[PDB]
Amino acid sequence: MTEYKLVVVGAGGVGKSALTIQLIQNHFVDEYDPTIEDSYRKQVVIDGETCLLDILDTAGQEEYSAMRDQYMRTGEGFLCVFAINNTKSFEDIHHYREQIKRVKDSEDVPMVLVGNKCDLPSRTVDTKQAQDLARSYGIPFIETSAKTRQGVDDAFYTLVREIRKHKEK
Ligand SMILES: C#Cc1c(F)ccc2cc(O)cc(-c3ncc4c(N5C[C@H]6CC[C@@H](C5)N6C(=O)[C@@H]5OC(=O)C5(C)C)nc(OC[C@@]56CCCN5C[C@H](F)C6)nc4c3F)c12
Numbered sequence: 526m527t528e529y530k531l532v533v534v535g536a537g538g539v540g541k542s543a544l545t546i547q548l549i550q551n552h553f554v555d556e557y558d559p560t561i562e563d564s565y566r567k568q569v570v571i572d573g574e575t576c577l578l579d580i581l582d583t584a585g586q587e588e589y590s591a592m593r594d595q596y597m598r599t600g601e602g603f604l605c606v607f608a609i610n611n612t613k614s615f616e617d618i619h620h621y622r623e624q625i626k627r628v629k630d631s632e633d634v635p636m637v638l639v640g641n642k643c644d645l646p647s648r649t650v651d652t653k654q655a656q657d658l659a660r661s662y663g664i665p666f667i668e669t670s671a672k673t674r675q676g677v678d679d680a681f682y683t684l685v686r687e688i689r690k691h692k693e694k
């Protein structure tokens with residue numbers, strides 16, 4: 526059975542843990558310990574293929590050891606998450622994209638840009654800004670809400686499809 530190692534990255538408070546728990550448990554968790562980094566498995570069928578998705582929900586004090594670089598290098602695909610109500614989280618996307626490219630040593634790593642919290646009315650990052658950033662990286666952009674589940678399956682399944690495309694190159 527094919528396993529896909531997915532890693533969820535992005536600034537604190539964007540909803541990385543809430544997205545992960547909405548995917549694995551179909552529930553919205555209002556409080557998930559901000560400091561805790563952990564991984565979960567979900568078996569799903571995507572385009573007819575039975576998948577094992579191993580999701581790593583990143584967290585913890587900012588550190589850059591050789592061991593952390595090797596841990597992040599295990600990822601096959603990355604969800605780069607910002608929150609639509611937080612301009613700084615969107616501005617930080619470049620940093621996360623560059624750390625992925627740094628440890629993978631490649632200009633072609635499967636990634637999806639995720640604009641989370643789309644259920645909130647206070648949007649400070651318009652869709653056009655994020656669509657432009659994603660087109661500049663050659664990756665898909667998807668808006669999600671971990672609260673309502675809008676776009677959640679689409680974000681993770683689109684990242685699996687990017688990994689499949691990459692393996693065919
Ligand atoms: C990811 C990642 C990553 C990759 F995607 C690929 C290879 C990596 C290889 C590496 O070795 C390391 C990392 C890595 N690990 C942690 C990171 C991290 N955390 C983790 C999360 C998110 C913010 C805060 C601190 N968090 C928390 O969970 C905190 O724990 C809490 O509780 C919070 C207070 C919520 N912060 C940042 O950057 C934050 C900024 C803002 C301040 C300066 N810094 C520089 C820019 F400006 C942006 N970068 C990080 C980083 F690159 C790698």
Ligand SMILES: Nc1nc2c(ncn2[C@@H]2O[C@H](COP(=O)(O)OP(=O)(O)O)[C@@H](O)[C@H]2O)c(=O)[nH]1
Pocket residue numbers: 536537538539540541542543544554555556557558559584641642643644645669670671672673
């Ligand atoms: N309204 C709403 N709140 C969310 C959503 N995702 C996360 N949150 C909330 O935002 C805060 C941070 O979420 P969390 O998953 O801990 O962010 P992380 O630090 O990226 O893991 C919590 O209070 C969550 O309930 C969402 O899509 N909509």
Ligand SMILES: [Mg+2]
Pocket residue numbers: 541542543557558559560561582583584
């Ligand atoms: Mg978290």
